């Protein structure tokens with residue numbers, strides 16, 4: 001089964017854990033990767049019920065299972081906070097322009 005489903009993408013807890021670890025390390029190092037510069041600050045304008053406190057940061061999680069290294073980031077993102085706590089997994093799949101919907 002999928003622990004998280006973003007549109008047609010299936011993710012296991014292992015996959016979110018791995019993506020989060022990479023994003024958080026970049027966060028600690030003050031570094032970013034890709035043309036859009038990830039990890040970047042996540043603003044919760046959609047008002048998703050996370051039980052972890054802000055600030056929040058978004059990092060791409062890839063359907064391939066590969067850790068994001070540049071190139072196309074796809075539509076899915078792992079949201080983590082300043083204390084390296086997982087807030088959730090979101091996606092642009094099925095949302096107009098910059099809206100996000102939560103993975104199921």
Ligand SMILES: [Ca+2]
Nearest residue numbers: 011012015065
């Ligand atoms: Ca996987």
